[PDB]
Amino acid sequence: ESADLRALAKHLYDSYIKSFPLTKAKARAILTGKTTDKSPFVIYDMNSLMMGEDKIKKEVAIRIFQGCQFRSVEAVQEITEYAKSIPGFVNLDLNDQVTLLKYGVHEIIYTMLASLMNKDGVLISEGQGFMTREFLKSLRKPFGDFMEPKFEFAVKFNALELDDSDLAIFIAVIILSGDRPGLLNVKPIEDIQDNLLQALELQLKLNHPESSQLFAKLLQKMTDLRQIVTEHVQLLQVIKKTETDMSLHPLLQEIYKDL
Ligand SMILES: COc1cccc(C(=O)COc2ccc(C[C@@H]3SC(=O)NC3=O)cc2)c1
Ligand SMILES: CCCCCCCCC(=O)O
């Protein structure tokens, strides 16, 4: 019954809206000058950056990057809340619950980070600010290209014109992989993903009828996400060696023992 797949698509969009304070609908409204929302203060340079403080709520490159870390630890909270709402996930082995989040969480962050980006920059502080791609290309030697490959993916991925109702199922298909390193019982996971994959395929067909093979085209973008993550990992172990005075959050440290 396709009808059950609709009930499931709508249950997931519902939880996605509950769990994520800044949707793609809101971010796109901010980014394109709409009247449902308010204009962001732009940071493109060092003077704009500290004028952001008297308008929005230690070195600069270091501060920027620890901001992403902190925002990332917040997302992991939102993602983990979205996870629980996915039918079946809290029924699984607790070890596998940990393993699925561990490997899925960054692929999801980088998917939802694309919603905040256009080719010229990225929203920050709940959309109250916008920081140019160029301003992030002139930070430091170790922090010179630690945000560019998310832009490169984001620009290509945003070209599919996905909705929040599309992304809610896609993000759930990511978590429920089952080819993840260290899983105890895979088959119960593969059962949930098969279901989520049929919900997504019907969703894309209905929401994007003129869009040939959007389903497959979105599945290939999972290949892009894995490279971003493994590139970021390598980047991270360089930064922690050049910068021995940079604290990393133990939550991110615990996720990052992966590969
Ligand atoms: C001050 O706040 C700012 C400033 C400038 C840009 C942003 C964006 O929000 C950047 O967006 C990102 C990028 C990467 C991550 C993943 C994290 S960062 C890391 O080193 N390890 C991770 O797992 C999360 C969020 C925020
Ligand atoms: C610029 C460093 C301040 C932390 C980044 C902004 C997040 C807000 C907060 O931590 O209270």
CATH number, domain of 5, equals 1.10.565.10
Q: Nearest to residue 221, comparing CAs of 159, 174, 157, 162? A: 157
Tell me the one-letter amino acid at 183.
Answer: L
Tell me if 70 CB under 6 Å of ligand 2: yes
CA angle 106, 103, 159 (to 5 degrees): 45
Q: Which domain holds residue 244?
A: 1-259
Specified resolution (Å): 2.7
Tell me if 63 CB under 6 Å of ligand 2: yes
Q: Beta-strand (E) ranges in 126-188? A: 129-132
Tell me if 84 CB under 6 Å of ligand 2: no
Q: What are phi and psi of 191, to 5 degrees?
A: -70, -45
CA of 69 to the centre of ligand 1 (A): 6
Q: How many DSSP H helices and E strands does the chain contain?
A: 10, 4
Count of beta carbons in the 10 Å neighbourhood of residue 237: 9
Q: Which of the ligands is closest to the CA of residue 129? A: 1
Atom of ligand 2 nearest to the CA of 71: 7
Return d(Cα 67, Cα 89) in angstroms, integer.
30
Q: Whose CA is nearest to atom 2 of ligand 1?
A: 67
Task: Quote the number of domains for the chain.
Answer: 1
Return d(Cα 127, Cα 123) in angstroms, integer.
5
